[PDB]
CSV table of C-alpha atoms in Angstrom, one decimal:
chain,number,residue,atom,x,y,z
A,1,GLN,CA,-8.0,-18.0,-12.9
A,2,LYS,CA,-10.6,-17.4,-15.7
A,3,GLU,CA,-13.8,-17.5,-13.7
A,4,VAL,CA,-13.7,-14.0,-12.1
A,5,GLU,CA,-13.2,-11.1,-14.5
A,6,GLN,CA,-12.9,-7.5,-13.5
A,7,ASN,CA,-11.3,-4.4,-15.0
A,8,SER,CA,-8.3,-3.1,-13.1
A,9,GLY,CA,-9.1,0.6,-13.5
A,10,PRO,CA,-8.3,2.7,-11.7
A,11,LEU,CA,-11.8,4.1,-11.6
A,12,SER,CA,-12.1,7.8,-10.5
A,13,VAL,CA,-15.3,8.9,-9.0
A,14,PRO,CA,-16.2,12.3,-7.6
A,15,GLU,CA,-16.7,12.6,-3.9
A,16,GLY,CA,-20.3,12.2,-3.0
A,17,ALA,CA,-21.2,10.5,-6.3
A,18,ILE,CA,-22.0,6.8,-6.7
A,19,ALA,CA,-19.1,4.5,-7.5
A,20,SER,CA,-20.0,1.5,-9.7
A,21,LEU,CA,-17.9,-1.6,-9.7
A,22,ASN,CA,-18.7,-4.5,-12.0
A,23,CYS,CA,-17.5,-8.1,-12.4
A,24,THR,CA,-18.4,-11.0,-14.8
A,25,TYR,CA,-18.1,-14.8,-14.2
A,26,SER,CA,-17.7,-17.6,-16.7
A,27,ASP,CA,-19.5,-20.5,-15.0
A,28,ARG,CA,-23.3,-20.3,-14.5
A,29,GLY,CA,-23.1,-23.1,-11.8
A,30,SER,CA,-21.6,-20.5,-9.5
A,31,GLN,CA,-24.0,-19.5,-6.8
A,32,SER,CA,-22.1,-17.6,-4.0
A,33,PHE,CA,-20.4,-14.2,-4.5
A,34,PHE,CA,-18.4,-11.8,-2.5
A,35,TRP,CA,-17.0,-8.3,-2.6
A,36,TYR,CA,-13.8,-7.8,-0.6
A,37,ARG,CA,-12.2,-4.4,0.2
A,38,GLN,CA,-8.4,-4.2,0.4
A,39,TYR,CA,-6.7,-1.0,1.4
A,40,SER,CA,-3.3,-0.5,-0.2
A,41,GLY,CA,-1.2,-1.8,2.6
A,42,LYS,CA,-3.6,-4.4,4.0
A,43,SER,CA,-5.4,-7.7,3.7
A,44,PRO,CA,-8.7,-8.2,1.9
A,45,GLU,CA,-11.7,-7.5,4.2
A,46,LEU,CA,-15.1,-8.8,3.4
A,47,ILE,CA,-17.7,-6.1,2.9
A,48,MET,CA,-20.6,-7.8,1.1
A,49,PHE,CA,-21.7,-11.2,0.0
A,50,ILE,CA,-24.7,-12.3,-2.1
A,51,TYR,CA,-26.0,-15.8,-2.6
A,52,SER,CA,-29.2,-15.2,-4.7
A,53,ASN,CA,-30.2,-13.2,-7.7
A,54,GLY,CA,-31.3,-9.7,-6.8
A,55,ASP,CA,-30.4,-6.7,-4.7
A,56,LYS,CA,-28.8,-6.1,-1.3
A,57,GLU,CA,-28.3,-2.9,0.6
A,58,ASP,CA,-26.1,-2.5,3.7
A,59,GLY,CA,-25.4,1.1,4.6
A,60,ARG,CA,-23.9,2.9,1.6
A,61,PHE,CA,-23.1,-0.4,-0.2
A,62,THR,CA,-25.5,-2.0,-2.7
A,63,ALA,CA,-24.5,-5.5,-4.1
A,64,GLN,CA,-26.4,-6.9,-7.1
A,65,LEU,CA,-26.2,-10.4,-8.5
A,66,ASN,CA,-27.6,-11.1,-12.0
A,67,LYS,CA,-27.5,-14.7,-13.0
A,68,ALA,CA,-29.0,-14.3,-16.4
A,69,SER,CA,-26.4,-11.9,-17.6
A,70,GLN,CA,-23.6,-13.5,-15.4
A,71,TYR,CA,-22.4,-10.3,-13.6
A,72,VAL,CA,-22.1,-9.1,-10.1
A,73,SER,CA,-21.9,-5.5,-9.0
A,74,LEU,CA,-21.1,-3.2,-6.1
A,75,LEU,CA,-22.6,0.3,-5.8
A,76,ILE,CA,-21.1,2.7,-3.3
A,77,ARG,CA,-23.4,5.6,-2.5
A,78,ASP,CA,-22.0,8.9,-1.2
A,79,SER,CA,-18.4,8.2,-2.0
A,80,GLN,CA,-16.0,9.2,0.8
A,81,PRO,CA,-12.2,9.5,0.9
A,82,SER,CA,-12.1,6.3,2.9
A,83,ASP,CA,-13.6,4.2,0.1
A,84,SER,CA,-10.4,4.7,-2.0
A,85,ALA,CA,-9.2,1.1,-2.1
A,86,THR,CA,-9.0,-2.0,-4.3
A,87,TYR,CA,-12.3,-3.8,-4.5
A,88,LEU,CA,-12.0,-7.6,-5.1
A,89,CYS,CA,-14.8,-9.6,-6.7
A,90,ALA,CA,-15.0,-13.2,-5.6
A,91,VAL,CA,-16.9,-16.4,-6.3
A,92,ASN,CA,-17.2,-19.6,-4.2
A,93,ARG,CA,-16.1,-22.6,-6.3
A,94,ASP,CA,-17.1,-25.7,-4.2
A,95,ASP,CA,-15.3,-24.9,-0.9
A,96,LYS,CA,-12.7,-22.3,-1.9
A,97,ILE,CA,-13.2,-18.6,-2.7
A,98,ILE,CA,-11.7,-17.5,-6.1
A,99,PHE,CA,-10.7,-13.8,-6.5
A,100,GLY,CA,-10.7,-11.5,-9.4
A,101,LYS,CA,-7.6,-9.3,-10.0
A,102,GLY,CA,-9.4,-6.3,-8.3
A,103,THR,CA,-10.5,-2.9,-9.4
A,104,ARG,CA,-8.8,0.2,-7.9
A,105,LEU,CA,-11.1,3.0,-6.9
A,106,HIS,CA,-10.0,6.6,-6.5
A,107,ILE,CA,-12.6,8.9,-4.9
A,108,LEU,CA,-11.6,12.3,-6.1
A,109,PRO,CA,-11.7,15.1,-3.4
A,110,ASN,CA,-13.9,18.1,-4.1
A,111,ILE,CA,-11.4,20.9,-4.1
A,112,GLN,CA,-13.3,24.1,-3.1
A,113,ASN,CA,-10.8,26.8,-4.1
A,114,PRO,CA,-7.8,25.4,-6.1
A,115,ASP,CA,-4.6,27.4,-5.8
A,116,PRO,CA,-2.0,25.4,-7.9
A,117,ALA,CA,1.6,26.3,-7.0
A,118,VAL,CA,5.1,24.7,-7.2
A,119,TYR,CA,7.2,25.3,-4.1
A,120,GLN,CA,10.8,24.3,-3.5
A,121,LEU,CA,11.7,22.8,0.0
A,122,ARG,CA,15.1,22.5,1.5
A,123,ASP,CA,16.6,19.9,3.8
A,124,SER,CA,16.4,20.5,7.6
A,125,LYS,CA,20.0,19.1,7.7
A,126,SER,CA,22.3,20.0,4.8
A,127,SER,CA,20.6,23.0,3.3
A,128,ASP,CA,21.8,22.0,-0.2
A,129,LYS,CA,19.4,19.1,-0.7
A,130,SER,CA,16.0,20.2,-2.0
A,131,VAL,CA,12.6,19.0,-3.1
A,132,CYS,CA,9.8,20.3,-5.3
A,133,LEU,CA,6.2,20.3,-4.1
A,134,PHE,CA,3.3,20.6,-6.5
A,135,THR,CA,0.2,21.2,-4.3
A,136,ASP,CA,-3.3,22.7,-4.2
A,137,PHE,CA,-4.3,21.7,-7.7
A,138,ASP,CA,-7.7,20.3,-8.6
A,139,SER,CA,-8.5,16.6,-8.5
A,140,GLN,CA,-8.5,16.0,-12.2
A,141,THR,CA,-4.9,17.2,-12.6
A,142,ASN,CA,-2.9,14.2,-13.9
A,143,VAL,CA,0.7,14.1,-12.6
A,144,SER,CA,2.9,12.3,-15.2
A,145,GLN,CA,5.8,10.1,-14.0
A,146,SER,CA,9.3,10.8,-15.0
A,147,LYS,CA,10.9,9.2,-18.0
A,148,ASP,CA,14.1,10.8,-16.8
A,149,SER,CA,16.1,8.3,-14.7
A,150,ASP,CA,17.6,11.2,-12.7
A,151,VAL,CA,14.2,12.7,-11.7
A,152,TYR,CA,11.8,11.1,-9.2
A,153,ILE,CA,8.1,12.2,-9.3
A,154,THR,CA,5.4,10.8,-6.9
A,155,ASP,CA,1.8,10.6,-7.9
A,156,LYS,CA,-1.2,12.6,-6.5
A,157,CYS,CA,-1.9,12.2,-2.8
A,158,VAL,CA,-4.8,13.9,-0.8
A,159,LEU,CA,-4.3,15.1,2.8
A,160,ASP,CA,-7.0,16.2,5.2
A,161,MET,CA,-6.5,19.0,7.7
A,162,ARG,CA,-9.5,17.5,9.5
A,163,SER,CA,-9.5,20.1,12.2
A,164,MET,CA,-9.7,23.0,9.6
A,165,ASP,CA,-11.9,20.9,7.2
A,166,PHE,CA,-9.5,21.5,4.3
A,167,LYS,CA,-8.4,18.8,1.8
A,168,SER,CA,-5.5,19.3,-0.6
A,169,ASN,CA,-3.7,17.3,-3.3
A,170,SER,CA,0.1,17.3,-3.9
A,171,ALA,CA,2.9,15.6,-5.7
A,172,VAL,CA,6.6,15.7,-5.1
A,173,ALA,CA,9.7,15.7,-7.3
A,174,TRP,CA,13.4,15.6,-6.6
A,175,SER,CA,16.6,14.8,-8.5
A,176,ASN,CA,20.1,13.5,-8.1
A,177,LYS,CA,21.1,16.9,-9.5
A,178,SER,CA,20.7,20.0,-7.2
A,179,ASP,CA,21.1,22.7,-9.9
A,180,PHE,CA,17.7,21.2,-10.9
A,181,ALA,CA,15.0,23.8,-10.4
A,182,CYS,CA,11.3,23.3,-9.8
A,183,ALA,CA,10.2,25.4,-12.8
A,184,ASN,CA,11.1,22.5,-15.2
A,185,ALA,CA,10.3,19.8,-12.7
A,186,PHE,CA,6.6,19.0,-13.5
A,187,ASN,CA,6.8,20.1,-17.1
A,188,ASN,CA,6.5,16.5,-18.3
A,189,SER,CA,2.9,16.8,-17.0
A,190,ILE,CA,0.0,19.0,-18.0
A,191,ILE,CA,-0.5,21.4,-15.1
A,192,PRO,CA,-2.9,24.4,-14.6
A,193,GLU,CA,-1.9,27.3,-16.8
A,194,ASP,CA,-1.9,29.8,-13.9
A,195,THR,CA,0.2,27.6,-11.5
A,196,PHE,CA,2.1,30.0,-9.2
A,197,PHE,CA,5.9,29.7,-9.5
A,198,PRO,CA,7.5,32.0,-6.9
A,199,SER,CA,11.1,33.2,-7.1
B,1,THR,CA,-8.2,-11.2,18.0
B,2,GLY,CA,-8.5,-12.3,14.4
B,3,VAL,CA,-6.3,-14.5,12.2
B,4,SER,CA,-2.6,-14.0,13.0
B,5,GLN,CA,0.5,-14.7,10.8
B,6,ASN,CA,4.2,-14.6,11.5
B,7,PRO,CA,6.6,-13.4,10.5
B,8,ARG,CA,5.2,-10.2,9.1
B,9,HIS,CA,8.2,-9.9,6.7
B,10,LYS,CA,10.9,-12.2,5.5
B,11,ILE,CA,14.0,-11.5,3.3
B,12,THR,CA,15.7,-14.7,2.0
B,13,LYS,CA,18.6,-15.3,-0.3
B,14,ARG,CA,17.5,-17.2,-3.4
B,15,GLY,CA,18.1,-21.0,-2.9
B,16,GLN,CA,17.2,-21.0,0.8
B,17,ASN,CA,14.2,-22.5,2.6
B,18,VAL,CA,11.6,-20.4,4.4
B,19,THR,CA,8.7,-21.2,6.6
B,20,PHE,CA,5.7,-19.1,7.5
B,21,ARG,CA,3.0,-19.7,10.1
B,22,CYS,CA,-0.7,-19.0,10.4
B,23,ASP,CA,-2.8,-19.0,13.6
B,24,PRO,CA,-6.4,-19.0,12.5
B,25,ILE,CA,-9.5,-18.2,14.5
B,26,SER,CA,-10.0,-21.2,16.7
B,27,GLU,CA,-13.6,-21.9,15.7
B,28,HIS,CA,-12.9,-22.3,12.0
B,29,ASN,CA,-12.7,-25.8,10.5
B,30,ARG,CA,-11.3,-24.4,7.2
B,31,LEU,CA,-7.9,-22.9,6.5
B,32,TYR,CA,-6.6,-21.4,3.2
B,33,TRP,CA,-3.3,-20.1,1.8
B,34,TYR,CA,-3.1,-17.6,-1.0
B,35,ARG,CA,-0.3,-15.7,-2.8
B,36,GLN,CA,-0.8,-12.1,-4.0
B,37,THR,CA,1.2,-9.7,-6.0
B,38,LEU,CA,0.5,-6.0,-6.4
B,39,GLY,CA,-2.3,-5.2,-8.9
B,40,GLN,CA,-3.5,-8.7,-8.8
B,41,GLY,CA,-6.0,-10.7,-6.7
B,42,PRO,CA,-5.2,-13.4,-4.2
B,43,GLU,CA,-4.3,-16.5,-6.1
B,44,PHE,CA,-5.4,-19.8,-4.4
B,45,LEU,CA,-2.7,-22.1,-3.1
B,46,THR,CA,-4.3,-24.8,-0.9
B,47,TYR,CA,-7.2,-25.5,1.4
B,48,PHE,CA,-7.4,-27.3,4.7
B,49,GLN,CA,-10.4,-28.8,6.4
B,50,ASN,CA,-9.4,-29.8,10.0
B,51,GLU,CA,-6.0,-31.4,9.5
B,52,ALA,CA,-6.7,-32.8,6.0
B,53,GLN,CA,-5.2,-30.8,3.1
B,54,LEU,CA,-8.2,-31.3,0.7
B,55,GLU,CA,-7.1,-29.2,-2.3
B,56,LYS,CA,-3.9,-27.9,-4.0
B,57,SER,CA,-3.5,-25.6,-7.0
B,58,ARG,CA,-0.8,-25.8,-9.6
B,59,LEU,CA,0.7,-22.7,-8.0
B,60,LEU,CA,1.5,-25.0,-5.0
B,61,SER,CA,4.4,-26.6,-6.9
B,62,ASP,CA,6.6,-29.5,-5.6
B,63,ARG,CA,8.9,-27.0,-3.7
B,64,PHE,CA,5.8,-25.8,-1.8
B,65,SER,CA,4.7,-27.7,1.3
B,66,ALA,CA,1.8,-26.8,3.6
B,67,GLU,CA,0.6,-28.6,6.8
B,68,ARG,CA,-2.0,-28.1,9.5
B,69,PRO,CA,-0.9,-30.8,11.9
B,70,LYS,CA,-3.5,-30.4,14.7
B,71,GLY,CA,-6.3,-28.9,12.5
B,72,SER,CA,-5.2,-25.6,14.0
B,73,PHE,CA,-2.2,-23.5,13.1
B,74,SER,CA,-0.7,-24.1,9.7
B,75,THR,CA,2.8,-23.8,8.3
B,76,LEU,CA,3.8,-23.2,4.6
B,77,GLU,CA,7.3,-24.1,3.6
B,78,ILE,CA,8.9,-23.0,0.3
B,79,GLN,CA,12.1,-24.9,-0.4
B,80,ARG,CA,14.9,-23.5,-2.6
B,81,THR,CA,13.4,-20.1,-3.0
B,82,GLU,CA,13.1,-18.4,-6.4
B,83,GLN,CA,12.7,-14.7,-7.2
B,84,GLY,CA,9.3,-15.5,-8.6
B,85,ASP,CA,8.2,-16.6,-5.1
B,86,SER,CA,8.4,-13.0,-3.9
B,87,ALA,CA,4.8,-12.1,-2.9
B,88,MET,CA,2.5,-11.6,0.1
B,89,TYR,CA,1.4,-14.9,1.5
B,90,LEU,CA,-2.1,-14.7,3.0
B,91,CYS,CA,-3.8,-17.0,5.3
B,92,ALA,CA,-7.6,-17.2,5.9
B,93,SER,CA,-10.0,-19.2,8.0
B,94,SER,CA,-13.7,-19.8,7.5
B,95,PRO,CA,-16.6,-21.2,9.5
B,96,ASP,CA,-18.4,-21.9,6.3
B,97,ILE,CA,-17.6,-19.9,3.1
B,98,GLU,CA,-16.9,-16.3,4.2
B,99,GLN,CA,-13.1,-15.9,4.5
B,100,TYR,CA,-11.3,-14.0,7.2
B,101,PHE,CA,-7.7,-13.0,6.4
B,102,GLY,CA,-4.6,-12.6,8.4
B,103,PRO,CA,-2.2,-9.7,8.0
B,104,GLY,CA,0.1,-11.7,5.7
B,105,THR,CA,3.8,-12.6,5.4
B,106,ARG,CA,5.6,-10.4,2.9
B,107,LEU,CA,8.4,-12.5,1.3
B,108,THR,CA,11.2,-11.0,-0.7
B,109,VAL,CA,13.7,-13.4,-2.4
B,110,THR,CA,16.9,-11.5,-3.2
B,111,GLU,CA,20.0,-12.7,-5.1
B,112,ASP,CA,22.1,-11.8,-2.2
B,113,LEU,CA,21.6,-10.4,1.3
B,114,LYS,CA,24.2,-7.7,0.4
B,115,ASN,CA,21.5,-5.9,-1.7
B,116,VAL,CA,19.5,-5.2,1.5
B,117,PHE,CA,19.8,-1.6,2.6
B,118,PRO,CA,18.1,0.5,5.3
B,119,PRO,CA,16.5,3.8,4.2
B,120,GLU,CA,18.1,7.1,4.5
B,121,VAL,CA,15.6,9.7,5.7
B,122,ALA,CA,15.4,13.5,5.4
B,123,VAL,CA,12.8,16.1,6.4
B,124,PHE,CA,12.3,19.1,4.1
B,125,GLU,CA,11.1,22.4,5.8
B,126,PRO,CA,8.1,24.4,4.6
B,127,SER,CA,8.7,26.9,1.8
B,128,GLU,CA,8.6,30.5,2.9
B,129,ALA,CA,6.6,31.2,-0.3
B,130,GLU,CA,3.9,28.7,0.6
B,131,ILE,CA,3.7,30.2,4.1
B,132,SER,CA,3.1,33.7,2.7
B,133,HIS,CA,0.7,32.5,0.0
B,134,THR,CA,-1.5,30.1,1.8
B,135,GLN,CA,-0.9,30.6,5.6
B,136,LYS,CA,-0.1,26.8,5.7
B,137,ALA,CA,3.2,24.8,5.9
B,138,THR,CA,3.9,21.5,4.2
B,139,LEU,CA,6.8,19.3,5.5
B,140,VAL,CA,8.0,16.7,3.1
B,141,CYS,CA,9.8,13.5,4.2
B,142,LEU,CA,11.9,11.5,1.7
B,143,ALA,CA,13.0,7.8,2.4
B,144,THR,CA,15.5,6.7,-0.2
B,145,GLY,CA,17.8,3.8,-1.0
B,146,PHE,CA,16.0,1.0,0.9
B,147,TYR,CA,15.7,-2.6,-0.3
B,148,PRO,CA,13.4,-4.5,0.2
B,149,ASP,CA,10.3,-2.4,-0.1
B,150,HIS,CA,8.8,-3.1,3.2
B,151,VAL,CA,8.8,0.1,5.3
B,152,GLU,CA,6.2,1.9,7.4
B,153,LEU,CA,6.5,5.7,7.4
B,154,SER,CA,4.8,7.8,10.2
B,155,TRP,CA,4.9,11.4,11.4
B,156,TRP,CA,5.5,12.3,15.0
B,157,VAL,CA,4.8,15.9,16.3
B,158,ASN,CA,6.0,16.6,19.9
B,159,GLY,CA,6.6,12.9,20.5
B,160,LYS,CA,3.0,11.8,19.5
B,161,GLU,CA,2.0,10.3,16.2
B,162,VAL,CA,-0.3,12.4,13.9
B,163,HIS,CA,-2.6,11.3,11.1
B,164,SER,CA,-4.5,14.6,10.3
B,165,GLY,CA,-2.9,16.6,7.5
B,166,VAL,CA,-0.8,13.6,6.4
B,167,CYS,CA,-0.4,12.1,2.9
B,168,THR,CA,2.0,9.2,2.2
B,169,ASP,CA,2.6,7.7,-1.2
B,170,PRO,CA,0.6,4.4,-1.4
B,171,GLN,CA,3.6,2.6,-2.8
B,172,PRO,CA,7.4,3.2,-2.8
B,173,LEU,CA,8.8,3.7,-6.3
B,174,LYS,CA,11.9,2.0,-7.7
B,175,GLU,CA,15.2,3.9,-7.9
B,176,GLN,CA,16.6,1.8,-10.7
B,177,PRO,CA,13.5,0.5,-12.5
B,178,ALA,CA,15.6,-1.5,-15.0
B,179,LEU,CA,17.3,-3.5,-12.2
B,180,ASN,CA,15.7,-6.6,-10.6
B,181,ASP,CA,16.9,-5.8,-7.1
B,182,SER,CA,16.3,-2.1,-7.3
B,183,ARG,CA,16.4,0.1,-4.2
B,184,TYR,CA,13.3,2.1,-3.5
B,185,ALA,CA,12.1,5.5,-2.5
B,186,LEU,CA,9.1,6.9,-0.6
B,187,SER,CA,7.8,10.4,0.1
B,188,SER,CA,5.2,11.8,2.5
B,189,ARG,CA,3.8,15.2,3.3
B,190,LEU,CA,2.6,16.7,6.5
B,191,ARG,CA,0.7,20.0,6.4
B,192,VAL,CA,0.2,22.2,9.4
B,193,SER,CA,-0.9,25.8,9.8
B,194,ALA,CA,1.8,28.4,9.4
B,195,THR,CA,1.5,29.5,13.1
B,196,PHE,CA,1.9,25.9,14.4
B,197,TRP,CA,5.1,25.7,12.2
B,198,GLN,CA,6.5,29.1,13.3
B,199,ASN,CA,6.3,27.9,17.0
B,200,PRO,CA,10.0,27.0,17.8
B,201,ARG,CA,9.0,24.5,20.6
B,202,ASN,CA,7.1,22.3,18.1
B,203,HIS,CA,9.2,19.2,17.1
B,204,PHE,CA,8.5,17.3,13.9
B,205,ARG,CA,9.8,13.7,13.2
B,206,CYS,CA,9.4,11.6,10.1
B,207,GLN,CA,9.9,8.0,11.2
B,208,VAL,CA,10.5,5.0,8.9
B,209,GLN,CA,10.3,1.5,10.3
B,210,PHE,CA,12.4,-0.7,8.0
B,211,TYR,CA,12.1,-4.5,8.1
B,212,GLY,CA,15.5,-6.0,7.3
B,213,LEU,CA,17.8,-8.9,8.2
B,214,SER,CA,17.2,-11.2,11.2
B,215,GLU,CA,19.6,-11.7,14.1
B,216,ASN,CA,20.4,-15.2,12.7
B,217,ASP,CA,21.1,-13.9,9.2
B,218,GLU,CA,24.7,-14.3,7.9
B,219,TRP,CA,26.3,-10.9,7.5
B,220,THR,CA,29.7,-10.8,5.7
B,221,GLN,CA,30.3,-7.1,5.1
B,222,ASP,CA,31.8,-4.2,7.1
B,223,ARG,CA,29.0,-1.7,6.5
B,224,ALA,CA,26.5,-2.2,9.3
B,225,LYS,CA,24.1,-5.2,9.1
B,226,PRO,CA,20.8,-3.8,7.7
B,227,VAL,CA,18.7,-5.4,10.4
B,228,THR,CA,15.1,-4.4,11.2
B,229,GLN,CA,15.5,-0.8,12.6
B,230,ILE,CA,13.9,2.6,12.7
B,231,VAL,CA,15.4,5.5,10.8
B,232,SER,CA,14.0,8.9,11.4
B,233,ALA,CA,14.8,12.6,10.7
B,234,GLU,CA,13.6,15.7,12.5
B,235,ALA,CA,12.9,19.4,12.2
B,236,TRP,CA,11.9,22.1,14.7
B,237,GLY,CA,9.6,25.0,13.9
B,238,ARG,CA,11.0,28.4,13.1
B,239,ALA,CA,9.5,31.9,13.8
B,240,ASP,CA,10.2,33.6,10.4
C-alpha cells in the first residue's frame, strides 16, 4: 500500500528519554488512525487510536494527529526496556485497517560501568567446541555482522539480572573452524579500545 | 480468551494445498485476514462481515480461498503453494474498527520436506576469566542446523524456567545466506552470579522447541523424521 508511510529505522533512543515515532498518510479523507505495537515474536497489539485532530495521552504514550500536515505521531515518555518493539502506524480505509511497514525501536540500556571484554566459552559436552562472547560493552557499540561465511556473529542483546539490578549487553561469535581464536573474532567491528582480552 | 488460530506452524512442500483456521472473538461481526513478512507490516488479504466476504485484495490471488461459513470461524485455503506464500498469516476480529489479532499461522513452503531438520543444541560453560573478572557467569546456548526457522528457546534452571538474566537473539540467522532453503542458527545467553554457578547441585538446561513435520507427513528417508520435538542440552555447576 501507498497510504501509510513510515521509516523502518531502527530508531535508537536512550533509556528514560522520549521516543518519537512518525508516520505520514497520502489521503486526506482518512479520519481514523491507530498505533499497533508488535513484539518481535508476536502479533500486533493495539496501543493507541486517534479519530480527531489533536493530542491524546494514555500513560506514557502520547498520540498526535495532524490533518493539515497529514502526519500521525506516537510519543513514548520515559522509555523502558520493554518498549523495544516494532511500532505499526495504521489508518482505517472504509472498513479495513491498512498498516505501514513498521518502525523498529531499540531503547538503549544505560550501562553504569562498562567493562568490555571478549571471553571464550567451551562446550559442556565435547570440550573442543567453543564460542566467543563479547559482553559488558556500552550501548552505542555497534557489532558488525560477518562477511566471512565460516564465521557466525549475533547482534547486541541486553539481559537484566533483575534481582541484582544489573543490565548488560553481549554478542556471540563462533566458527566452523576451532583453531579460530576470539582475539580476531570481533575485529570486523569497531570495539572499545581497552576491551579486555584474557589469555 | 482472545482470537485463536490453528495450526501455529505449517511446513508444506511446494505444490501442495494447505488450510488454516481462525476462531475469532464471538461478539465480533468483522473478520480479517492478513499476510506479514519480517520487516514489513501486515498486508491486507480479505475482510468478512458476518458470513459475507465483502472485500478482497490483489494479494488474495485465484489460488487463495477464504470462507466464514457460519459468520464465525474462518478458513483460508492456499492451493498449489509457492515459495512466495511463505509468511505469517494473521487473523483479526473487530466489533467496529479496532482490530484484535490472533497469534498467527507461520507457513513455510519448502521445495522438499527433506530440507527440514531439527536443531542441534549445545550449552557453553562460563569462562573462568569472566568469573574472576566480574564475579558473574554467562552460559551460552547455540541452536544450529534447523529448518524451518520456527523454534522457541528457553532456559531451565533446576527444572524451572527462568527469564531473569536471559537474552535470546530476536531472530535466527541463516547458515547459508545464498541458499533459498538455508538452515538457521540461534544463540542465547544466561547470566548468573559466579557463586550460583559454582554450586554443583544447580542444573542448567537450554531447551529448543522445534516445530517440524506432522504425523501425517510423508517421510521417505532413513534419518529420523524431523517431527515437532524438543531438543535440549544441559550443564551442571562446578566449584572452581
